[PDB]
C-alpha cells in the first residue's frame, strides 16, 4: 500500500521484544519498505485461502498473542533478506528485489510451513508438536531459500535433486541463524518444535542419524514417501556441509573444516552457477568442487576439504 514508513514494536513467538518496519495509512501495516520492493506479511485467519489480508494494526504495537507469529515472520524475513544481500550480494529471492510475501495463521493446528511457488506460508502448530513456526529463524530462512532455489538451480522436488533442494534450505537456514547469532546451532527447527521437550529438533545436520536420517549414501532412502525422501536423504548432504564447515572424522574419513563463511560461498556459487533442475548428489559434488576451485584455486585446502566431506558421506 501507499503510505509512510514507520517503526512498530512487538513481541515474537518466544516472547522477545523487537522493532518492526511498518507502513502507515490509516492503519499500520506489516509492510517493510526498507528492503527491496518490500516485505509484506499477511493474516490467513486460520483458513487456507492465500495470501489473506495484509496485516493491519491500529496502534503500531504488536504485543498480542495473535500478533506474535506475524512479528517473527516479518522480522526474520528481514534478517534473511539482509543475509542474502550483505553476504552474497543477492537482492531478494529473484535477484531483482522481488517483494517478499508471507502469510501466518495458516489453517488450524498446522504443523508445517512452505513456499507455495509465490510466497511463504506458516502454520501455528497444534501447540504440542509445534508452536507457530515463524518463531524459528532457521525455519523462515529455510522457506525463503526455497524461493532462491526455484529462481536459480530450479532443483526438482523429488529424489536426489529434491534432497539437494531440501539440504540447500537447511544449510542456508542454518547460516542465517548463525548470521543473526542468537543461540545458533546445526539443528533445524529447535525453537518451535515440541515446547514440552527440551533439546530436540526436527533434523540435525551435525548428526542426521540422531533422528533416523541417513548420514551416508549407502543408507539413502529409495522408496516413494516424502517425494522420494527429500527431507530424509537431505541428511547425507547436510552432513557433508557440516563437515566442510566444522570438520570431523566420519566413518573413518577425516575432513579439515574451513568454516561457515566459506561453506556458504561455495554452496551459494554451486546453487547459482552450476546446479540444474535434475542435478543428483554426484553432480552436486562436482558443482561444489568446481565452485571451491573458482573461489580458492584447484590446489586449495577448500577444494581438498570439499572432496573429503563428500568422500565421508559416500558420494563420488
Ligand atoms: C523447516 C521446517 C520447519 C519446515 C519444512 N517445510 P518445507 O518447506 O520443506 C515443506 N515443503 C512442502 O510443502 O513441499 C510441497 C510443496 C511443493 C510446491 C508447492 C507447495 C508445497 C519441513 O522440513 N517440513 C517437513 C515436515 C516437518 C516440519 C518436519 C514436520 C515436511 O514437509 O516433510
Ligand atoms: Ca496493536
Ligand atoms: Ca538455535
Ligand atoms: Ca537451528
Ligand atoms: Ca522441543
Ligand atoms: Zn523445505
Rounded CA separation 306/134 (Å): 32
User: Residues with catalytic annotation?
Assistant: 143, 231
- Alpha helix stretches (DSSP H) within the chain: 68-88, 137-151, 159-180, 225-229, 234-246, 260-273, 281-296, 301-312
CB 73 within 8 A of CB 140: yes
Name all residues whose Cβ lies below 6 A of ligand 1: 111-117, 133, 139, 142-143, 146, 157, 188-189, 202, 226, 231
Ligand 1: which of 176, 200, 231 to mutate, judged by most atoms within 8 Å of the beta carbon? 231
57 in a labelled binding site: yes
Approach to solving: X-ray
CA of residue 17 relative to chain centroid, distance: 22
Residue 112 alpha carbon to ligand 5 centre in Å: 15
Q: Which residues pair with 62 in a beta bridge?
A: 10
By alpha-carbon position, which residue is closest to atom 21 of ligand 1? 116
If you measure from the C-alpha of residue 112 to the centroid of ligand 1, how many angstroms do you get, rounded to a whole number? Answer: 6
- Report the alpha-carbon distance of residue 22 to residue 20 in Å, rounded: 6
CA of 61 to the centre of ligand 2 (A): 4
Domains for the chain: give ranges and CATH numbers.
6-154 (3.10.170.10), 155-315 (1.10.390.10)
- 10 Å Cβ neighbour count for 151? 16
The verdict on whether residue 96 carries a ligand-binding annotation is no
* Residue nearest (by alpha carbon) to ligand 1 atom 15: 114
Which contacts qualify for 55-61: CB closer than 8 Å, 24 or more apart? 55/29, 55/30, 56/27, 56/28, 56/29, 57/8, 57/22, 57/27, 57/28, 57/29, 57/30, 58/27, 58/28, 59/28, 60/6, 60/7, 60/8, 60/9, 60/22, 60/24, 60/28, 61/8, 61/9, 61/10
H helices, E strands: number in the chain: 8, 15
- Ligand 1 atom having least distance to the Cα of 230: 33
Cell of 75: 522480522
Residue 193 alpha carbon, nearest atom of ligand 1: 3
* Cα separations in angstroms, 127 against 43, 74, 82, 120: 19, 21, 30, 21
**How far does residue 181's CA lie from ligand 2's centre (Å)?**
28
Taking the C-alpha atoms of residue 243 and residue 36, their distance in angstroms, rounded to an integer, is 34
272 is in an annotated binding site: no
What's this structure's resolution in Å? Answer: 1.5
> DSSP code of 206?
S
From 117, 130, 135, select the one nearest 183 (Cα to Cα): 135
Most informative mutation of 104, 106, 114 for ligand 1 (most atoms within 8 A of CB) = 114
- Rounded CA-CA distance 46/165 in Å is 28
Q: Check the annotation: does 142 bind a ligand.
A: yes
Amino acid at each position: 500500500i501507499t503510505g509512510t514508513s514507520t517503526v512498530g514494536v512487538g513481541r515474537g513467538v518466544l516472547g522477545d521484544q523487537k522493532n518492526i518496519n511498518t507502513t502507515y495509512s490509516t492503519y499500520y501495516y506489516l509492510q517493510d519498505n526498507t528492503r527491496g520492493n518490500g516485505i509484506f506479511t499477511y493474516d490467513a485467519k486460520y483458513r487456507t485461502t492465500l495470501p489473506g489480508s495484509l496485516w493491519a494494526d491500529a496502534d503500531n504495537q504488536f504485543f498480542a498473542s495473535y500478533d506474535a507469529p506475524a512479528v517473527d515472520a516479518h522480522y526474520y524475513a528481514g534478517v534473511t533478506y539482509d543475509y542474502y544481500k550483505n553476504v552474497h550480494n543477492r537482492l531478494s529471492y529473484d535477484g531483482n528485489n522481488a517483494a517478499i510475501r508471507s502469510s501466518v495463521h495458516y489453517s488450524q493446528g498446522y504443523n508445517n510451513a512452505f513456499w507455495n511457488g509465490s510466497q511463504m506460508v506458516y502454520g501455528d502448530g497444534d501447540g504440542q508438536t509445534f508452536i507457530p513456526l515463524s518463531g524459528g529463524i532457521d525455519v523462515v530462512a529455510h522457506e525463503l531459500t526455497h524461493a532462491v532455489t526455484d529462481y536459480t538451480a530450479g532443483l526438482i522436488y523429488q529424489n536426489e535433486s529434491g534432497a539437494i533442494n531440501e539440504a540447500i534450505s537447511d544449510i542456508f537456514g542454518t547460516l542465517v541463524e548463525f548470521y543473526a547469532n542468537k543461540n545458533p546451532d546445526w539443528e533445524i527447527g529447535e525453537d518451535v518444535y515440541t515446547p514440552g521437550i527440551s533439546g530436540d529438533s526436527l533434523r540435525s545436520m551435525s548428526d542426521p542419524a540422531k533422528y533416523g536420517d541417513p548420514d551416508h549414501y549407502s543408507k539413502r532412502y529409495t522408496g516413494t514417501q516424502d517425494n522420494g525422501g527429500v527431507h530424509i536423504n537431505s541428511g547425507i548432504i547436510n552432513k557433508a556441509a557440516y563437515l566442510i564447515s566444522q570438520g570431523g572424522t566420519h566413518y573413518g574419513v577425516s575432513v579439515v573444516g574451513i568454516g561457515r563463511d566459506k561453506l556458504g560461498k561455495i554452496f551459494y556459487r554451486a546453487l547459482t552457477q552450476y546446479l540444474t533442475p535434475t542435478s543428483n548428489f554426484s553432480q552436486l559434488r562436482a558443482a561444489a568442487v568446481q565452485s571451491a576451485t573458482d573461489l580458492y584455486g584447484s590446489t586449495s585446502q577448500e577444494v581438498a576439504s570439499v572432496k573429503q566431506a563428500f568422500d565421508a558421506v559416500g558420494v563420488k
